[PDB]
């Protein structure tokens, strides 16, 4: 199928372009903001999405015969105030990514594609996971004024449905 | 200094994009040539260039107080035939690499900025390690002709006092 | 080489009476301020400075055949206000030796003298992470306002494949 | 009391200067005399003032609300002239430690403070220790001519209920 | 680099033909002046010669694209007269090992060679090291007269951070 | 016995001449002709001439109150084309290395020494084995045209342990 195909290359694309970005956002956190385990958390972040996010979709191109297409093309030129609006970027970011997955999961099942609904169940699941460990970091900035208080908690965060 | 920054940031660039063009060679090794070995290697070459060589550079900016930019551009619109032109193309982009980090000890030498050469002689070593293992593999496309024999070596490849 | 064994004899002096300042300071510190764990963090600091520091000079002269002086002289006369200000002297006192450092390396470059450049490499290399483990206690003391607070993560800091 | 604080302040004056002078013993008798353990007891002797010797006194100065001082002053122009002077020359400055131990005991006797006559026992008693101790090296050089032989002896010195 | 490579063919050589000097003098030690444990050292120095030394030049010219020559001429034809005689003239030998050194890491630098200036940091470090523990056994010799006591020290010399 | 001293002497020379032609065959067969494991072979090769087999000597000399003699001259200017003629010629050495040995036995036991005679055993026994094992690695080069596989040949001919014959060993 081809529309599958090329909605999983956009998936691709969008994945490396986010990793890419939370790299320069954990720099920035850590170097500017005097915030290192937010640096941390965010750094874990963009790991994530730079390894198996990108991986499960080549190994998939590989088995089920479809093309893999590169293009990437990133420029931060623009950064937040705050570590508070550094977080709420990010959270915006994962927002976006739920709904691109749904539109991806509602197209495979139009084409009676089951293979594909049956890989796209992970990426379902994973997002849902990732904007609930980013909305439990989002919600500290509430909770307190003081910096170190958010850092040791952001740290020893750090240190069956939904797993 | 500026000039160093400069070179810095030069070098951070192209470690990002070397580093997303194999893994597109490495997808296209295994999947269109029949060498899954052959992948793999490329693959960790690939992980090698995204992660350490990029982390290095991020934090000893972090520590001497130096500026980070960001601008990513690649496309791959264009591979090679074989697995032999392949990785004699990965060979020359290693070969590349090698120059850029040449000129950039210089530079630091020519700045009286010591802690700038110090931390450039682990990319120096680097350079001519990974140069010799990627001439390790080309060279076995010379010596066979059975793509059976030369994946079982590349896999059992894959599985020192001064270069370590 | 007679320049280089003057710039290694200042050295010496300069690490003594460092070390022999921050014993000072790390009285100041614990006694006055009610800091006890600043004042620990500054006495790893006097004794380092009064051990390896001044070990590996007195080494070399040994094993190179240069000569040793002794003239040491110092006297605390004023201190800091604030335990903020106090870390904040003990900032800059780092960042004099960074450059003591890279004038000795300079020179000994300028000699044609590779066992003395390859020995200063290793207080190149210690002068930047003494700065950074100074500057992450530093940076605390804009971060909170509760002495106890700050108090507990310097504790718990005191409790890399490059800069190693 | 004030007299009490003066002569504790003298003392850590007293065993700064001592341990600065022992470690130039130290590096004379390895360097100069061709003998690497004398040089290894003299250094063990310095670190020894440089440590606990001071970290005791500012530790009760912390307990019992008295004022430190820093003033120091050394300069080491003139050596002996063989391995026997030189450890006969550290046996007359421990000799001299006793009588200011001896000094502070007898003034804190004077002034109805029981506590510092409780710390002071401690000096009291390793000032004795350290002297027997050096007379033992002392007198090796008057049972035999042989450097190697004085030399195995000291090694293997290196390497009591009342007195402990 | 043409220079280059005729530099490390002479320190080749050089190696190649101490270590079997070496050898003969190990054997004329033990077997001629009665002392075994002298000629057990100067043969480990020959081993270290005939080993390493030359090992880690011809791995570098497989991984670097060099030319490698044999061309090798020793004639032992006059012995010293003592053992002091002999371990002095080895220090002479090692003493002119550090200053080839040093001229092959000048030329490197001057060539914007930074590959050879990371190799030859290996020499520069362990050429102070050899010196320093062969003037270790030439200074015994002026310690004593007695031959067994200066026997049994050395059996037991042959049974760092920065010079490691 | 002043000839057995002489043909000791020759010995050690030869040792040294040939363990130091066999470092520069095993960097060429590793750095020119792509074989990294048939160098890996020949670098035992010299470092076992370069060892016991002079240590020995001297050791001998030592107790037995003979004189030592080093006179060492040594350059390659001439390598062979392949890694077929370059083991053959390591083959055409070890050869040598035999009927050299057997001379000096001979000469040994016509002076009534049986001491030496006693000592050049080691070496009778030593010389055929090393030339057994330097033919086990000639002979691949005829039953196979790939060099890859006699590659994986040689490499677990050199790696995998040592087993002493009970009379060769
Ligand atoms: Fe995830
Ligand atoms: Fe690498
Ligand atoms: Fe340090
Ligand atoms: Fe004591
Ligand atoms: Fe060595
Ligand atoms: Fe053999």
Redo the contacts between chains.
């Keep these: 199928s081809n529309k599958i195909n090329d909605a999983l290359n956009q998936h691709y694309k969008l994945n ?1 372009e986010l990793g ?2 939370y ?2 956002y954990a ?1 920035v956190a ?2 500017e903001f ?1 915030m290192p385990y937010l640096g941390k958390f965010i750094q874990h972040l963009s790991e994530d999405k ?1 390894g198996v996010h ?1 991986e499960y979709i ?1 190994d998939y ?2 088995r089920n015969g479809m093309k ?1 297409k ?7 030129k623009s950064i937040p105030s705050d570590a508070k609006a550094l977080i709420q970027e990010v959270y915006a970011r994962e927002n976006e990514v739920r709904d691109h997955v749904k539109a991806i999961a509602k197209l495979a099942l139009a084409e009676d594609d089951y293979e594909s609904f049956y890989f796209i169940q992970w990426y379902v699941r994973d997002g849902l996971k990732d904007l609930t460990e980013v909305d439990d970091v989002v919600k500290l900035f509430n909770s307190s004024n ?4 958010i ?2 908690t952001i740290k020893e965060m750090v240190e069956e449905i939904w797993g």
């Design positions: 490396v890419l970005v790299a320069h720099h850590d170097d005097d730079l990108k080549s191109f590989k893999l590169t293009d990437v093309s990133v420029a931060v003081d910096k170190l208080i850092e040791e």
